[PDB]
Design a protein around this motif. Structure first.
Motif, short mmCIF file in Angstrom:
data_model
loop_
_atom_site.label_atom_id
_atom_site.label_comp_id
_atom_site.label_asym_id
_atom_site.label_seq_id
_atom_site.Cartn_x
_atom_site.Cartn_y
_atom_site.Cartn_z
N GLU A 1 9.75 75.95 16.70
CA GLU A 1 11.01 75.44 17.22
C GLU A 1 11.93 75.00 16.08
OE1 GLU A 1 10.20 77.04 20.00
OE2 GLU A 1 11.97 75.88 20.60
N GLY B 1 15.59 76.66 15.41
CA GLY B 1 16.79 75.86 15.26
C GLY B 1 17.58 76.24 14.03
N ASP C 1 19.29 79.49 14.61
CA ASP C 1 20.44 79.23 15.47
C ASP C 1 21.58 78.59 14.68
OD1 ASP C 1 18.96 78.29 18.71
OD2 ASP C 1 19.18 80.23 17.69
N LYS C 2 21.25 77.81 13.65
CA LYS C 2 22.28 77.20 12.83
C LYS C 2 22.95 78.29 11.99
CE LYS C 2 24.71 74.15 10.55
NZ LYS C 2 25.90 73.51 11.19
#
Length: 124
Positions: free
Chosen positions: A13, A17, A20-21
């Motif tokens: 996860e 993240g 996704d950033k």
């Protein structure tokens, strides 16, 4: 217990993240590119912001690359045992999935950069 794996999913996860950033920064880069190209007299501050974004992308990507390589090295070390297990297979699946997502975002970024360089050159 199952400390190794529960800690592994938390690392999955974390990597998600980060990816996704990167994706989010890539979209902002596209916005800055457009603003710079649409401006009669581009703002130096905007160019500076674009530079920090690119820097941030490069940094977060190395973090992703580094964590994924680490996971892979661990998987291979396990395979040196000439034996398989449910956890090994779960880890192999998450690594290939995270890798796919990472390759997609970086490919989109490279294409955005190539396109911008082309427009800046074809210019003024």
């Amino acid at each position: 217990r199952d400390r190794f794996m529960d800690e592994f999913f938390e690392q999955v996860e974390e990597i998600r993240g980060f990816i996704d950033k990167i994706a989010e920064n890539v979209e902002e880069v596209k916005r800055k590119h457009s603003a710079i190209l649409a401006s009669p007299n581009p703002d130096e501050k905007t160019k500076e912001e674009l530079e920090e974004l690119m820097s941030d992308i490069k940094k977060t990507a190395n973090k992703v690359r580094s964590k994924l390589k680490s996971i892979e090295q661990s998987i291979e070390q396990e395979e040196g045992l000439n034996r398989s297990s449910a956890d090994l297979r779960i880890r192999k699946t998450q690594h290939s999935t995270l890798s796919r997502k990472f390759v997609e975002v970086m490919s989109e970024y490279n294409a955005t950069q190539s396109d911008y360089r082309e427009r800046c050159k074809g210019r003024i």
